């Protein structure tokens, strides 16, 4: 049906949108602190401690599957990333710190891309 392809262009669209927003976002990362997933062979007791582990480079695989409805869906995966560094790292950390650096950095960023998914549709 033509309502369906409608949909899939849409879904095309926030798709090239939120890639946009997360070369932003990683681009906050220069440290590439939040690019890959937690090593579970280097952190071995990471999973006891965090049971939703994610990193840019998940988020980056989802994206391609055009895996993200809604711009809500994406927030809660880099919520994630920032959300699990300040648990299991120490306030007095190099790790927890550049969390709440690119937290703050990443506001405005997300902040323009809600009023542009709410303004083009
Ligand atoms: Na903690």
């Known amino acids: 049906s033509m309502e369906q392809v409608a949909m899939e262009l849409r879904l095309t669209e926030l798709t090239r949108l939120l890639r946009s927003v997360l070369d932003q976002l990683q681009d906050k990362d220069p440290a590439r602190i939040f690019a890959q997933p937690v090593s579970l062979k280097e952190v071995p007791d990471y999973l006891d401690h965090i049971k939703h582990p994610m990193d840019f480079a998940t988020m980056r695989k989802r994206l391609e599957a055009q895996g993200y409805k809604n711009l ?21 950390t190099v790790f927890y710190r550049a969390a709440v650096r690119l937290r703050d ?17």
């Open 72 to 92: 809500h869906e994406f927030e809660e995966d880099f919520d994630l990333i920032i959300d699990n560094c300040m648990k299991y790292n120490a306030r007095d």
């Open 105 to 121: 950095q990443g506001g405005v960023v997300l902040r323009q891309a809600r009023r542009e998914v709410d303004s083009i549709g």
